[PDB]
């Protein structure tokens, strides 16, 4: 046949942009803006971790593993801190130029998650957490999960974790607190640390589900097959050991 009939055969079908009218423009802007900001926040968390005294002494593979497990623990806890210091847990203070009023929000699943992100913030408000307690607690959140088959530098990891656990005690003391209320504060701050496992699990679940439905499925449907293949588990119940202060 003709060379032009070949061109006509190989002309691709036009692509749909995926413009979903069910989603208001403001909602769409907020959830695309937060995805981009989160990408940058992850980059900032890696740079921060590289500078944590002790962290670069762990094997490079462990450093990677710790950051992979904990990026959203660090982001959700810093979001909690800023939301406490700026709005006293009334609003989600993602950035100085991006403050979200949970009431002027269209979807309830978004709302429940906002109330859950506000829960971290209301607990930091309720307990009147200090900058130094926060800094020690945030460092401990980078060290809150390990592989079930252990890290390459497991013994060093344990020593570092204990060092920052001791560092949290030192920070509680500087509140000029009563000895009995100090043992009580350690219990409450570590209980809030433990609760981050459920806060993050639920938050990542909601984020991934919303992203796949509202962004991937609508604006890149072709990406889906490889996304769902890469998501397959290597082990039946995963390889993440979530560390708890209270069993």
């Amino acid at each position: 046949p003709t060379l032009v009939s070949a061109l006509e055969t190989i002309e691709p079908e036009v692509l749909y942009a995926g413009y979903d009218s069910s989603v208001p423009d403001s909602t769409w802007r907020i959830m695309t803006t937060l995805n981009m900001l989160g990408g940058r926040q992850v980059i900032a968390a890696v740079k921060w971790a590289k500078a944590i005294p002790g962290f670069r002494n762990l094997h490079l593979d462990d450093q990677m593993t710790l950051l992979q497990y904990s990026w959203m623990y660090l982001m959700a806890f810093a979001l909690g801190w800023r939301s406490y210091r700026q709005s006293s847990a009334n609003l989600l203070c993602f950035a100085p130029d991006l403050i979200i009023n949970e009431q002027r929000m269209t979807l309830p699943d978004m709302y429940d998650q906002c109330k859950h992100m506000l829960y971290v913030s209301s607990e930091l408000h309720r307990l009147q957490v200090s900058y130094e307690e926060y800094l020690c607690m945030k460092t401990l959140l980078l060290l809150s999960s390990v592989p079930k088959d252990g890290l390459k530098s497991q013994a060093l990891f344990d020593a570092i974790r204990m060092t920052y656990i001791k560092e949290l005690g030192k920070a509680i003391v500087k509140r000029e607190g009563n000895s009995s209320q100090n043992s009580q504060r350690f219990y409450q701050l570590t209980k809030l640390l433990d609760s981050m496992h459920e806060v993050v699990e639920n938050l990542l679940n909601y984020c991934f589900q919303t992203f796949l439905d509202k962004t991937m499925s609508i604006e890149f449907p072709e990406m889906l097959a490889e996304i769902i293949t890469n998501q397959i588990p290597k082990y039946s119940n995963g390889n993440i050991k979530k560390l708890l202060f209270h069993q």
Binding site: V42, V46, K47, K50, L60, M64, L67, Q68, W71, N230
Partner: peptide
């Protein structure tokens, strides 16, 4: 996997 690229780039850089 996608986040893994961001982390390794920022880790090695």
């Amino acid at each position: 996997l996608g986040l893994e690229d961001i982390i390794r780039k920022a880790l090695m850089g």
